[PDB]
């Protein structure tokens, strides 16, 4: 169905030693496929997926050059943003940048986004139409004006509605076996009596891709929005994800409760009853 | 591919 390509950039200043630490990662859907770290020995863009290694030397040279340009821009940005906020020279600060694009089932452009942040809070972003900016505080306004003078949004829109979709389509074609797969979760539920009277029923979900899923509890049709605990979806370390949801119930009332799971790899949403 | 246009600082 729908797919996306995303890029994340982080830069943290070290006011006592060396240049700021810079890290970049690239994702297609839920799969990381590329990375760069300024503290590594290679000082090159490195692959992280089997299907991206088909690219030739020119691809890696160009990507390395562009990402080093990114890091230089972040360094200057940290230097300027320190002055813009009247902060001392001894602290450590962070700039974060993220952009990407979406496509639908027809692999046509759907939406794009570009956002900036300083010290963990919003600084400036592009609106939904990709034609005007949104500033958070007064300090951002100056930057907004300058960029409005420099036609930055035109370049960004050209990249987001253009090159981004073409790169995404090429990646989806070259990685059809792994990028377009879907794995239905393996599901089972367990029971644990707490001390003597209450008990907990926990329904799991193992080894599913992609990472978007829904878990719910029902008591004869009653939607249990409360009285249940569910943890954040977590990676397994091999390309799949895990989740579980638990509910505490009086003993002897297990058949009254059921766990419902819906993924996109399931033709029909499931329903689990204890034993 | 990463953004390949003109770079602009804050």
């Amino acid at each position, epitope marked *: 169905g729908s797919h996306s390509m995303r890029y994340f950039f982080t830069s943290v200043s070290r006011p006592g030693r060396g240049e700021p630490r810079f890290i970049a990662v690239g994702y297609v859907d839920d799969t990381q496929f590329v990375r760069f770290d300024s503290d590594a020995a290679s000082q090159r863009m490195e692959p992280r997926a089997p299907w991206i290694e088909q690219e030739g030397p020119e*691809y890696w040279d160009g*990507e390395t050059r562009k990402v080093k340009a990114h890091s230089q821009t972040h360094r200057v940005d940290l230097g300027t943003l320190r002055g813009y906020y009247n902060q001392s020279e001894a602290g450590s600060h962070t700039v974060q940048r993220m952009y990407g694009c979406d496509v639908g089932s027809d692999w046509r452009f759907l939406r794009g986004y570009h956002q900036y942040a300083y010290d963990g809070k919003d600084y400036i972003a592009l609106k939904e139409d990709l034609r005007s900016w949104t500033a958070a505080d007064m300090a951002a306004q100056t930057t907004k004006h300058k960029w409005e003078a420099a036609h930055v949004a035109e370049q960004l829109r050209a990249y987001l509605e*253009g090159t981004c979709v073409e790169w995404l389509r090429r990646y989806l074609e070259n990685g059809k076996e792994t990028l377009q797969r879907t794995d239905a979760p393996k599901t089972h539920m367990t029971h644990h009596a707490v001390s003597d009277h209450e008990a907990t029923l926990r329904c799991w979900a193992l080894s599913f891709y992609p990472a978007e899923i829904t878990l719910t509890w029902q008591r004869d049709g009653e939607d249990q929005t409360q009285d249940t605990e569910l943890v954040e979806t977590r990676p397994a370390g091999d390309g799949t994800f895990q989740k579980w949801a638990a509910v505490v119930v009086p003993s002897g009332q297990e058949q009254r409760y059921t766990c419902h799971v819906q993924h996109e790899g399931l033709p029909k949403p499931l329903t689990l009853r204890w034993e | 591919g990463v953004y390949d246009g003109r770079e602009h600082t804050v």
Partner: T-cell receptor
Amino acid sequence: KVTQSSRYLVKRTGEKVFLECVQDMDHENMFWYRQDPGLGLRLIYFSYDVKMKEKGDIPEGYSVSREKKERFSLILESASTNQTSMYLCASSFTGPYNSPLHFGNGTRLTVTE
Amino acid sequence: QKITQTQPGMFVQEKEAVTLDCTYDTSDPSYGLFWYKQPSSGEMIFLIYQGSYDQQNATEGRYSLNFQKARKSANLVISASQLGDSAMYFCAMRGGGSGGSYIPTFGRGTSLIVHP
């Protein structure tokens, strides 16, 4: 606004020749081109930005220097007869989005024995 | 990433429209096409630019472009030709830098002569 040092030059073989190119638009990319009859434009050298440089398809016999942002110097170490041509300098922003090259008026150079 | 202008030399009567042809091929996801005019003085004058991801053709004064991405052609159209249009015209392309080379590539050149 791109300016080259001279418009006409005549030199003797064996001399060291200097060619200058200055722009004031605060452009990153700079290029040195050579024009010959029936051969079109051929790139000698180009520079992404300050202090870095890369060879073109005919870099033999020339050297370059990009110590500054707004200057791109070309040097002929030993002038030879087969270096008689017209030389052009260009500058532009980075990337393919509405970024054409901006040429100067050119410099015609003749090397005689 | 290469450009070819097949036809050397064109002739046109004054107060008439003429078309100069240019065909390109590339695999770079992002690129732009653009045209120059060089008179007898020897300078290069920028005429028109068009990217690969914009609807409509670029128009500027008497200069327009016939851009066919499907068959990879970027033809330059001159309307109401004048005597001062006799020059050498160049077709050029540049790319993003990861799907191909970064340095611009130029066409061979096409000469245009206007007759009174």
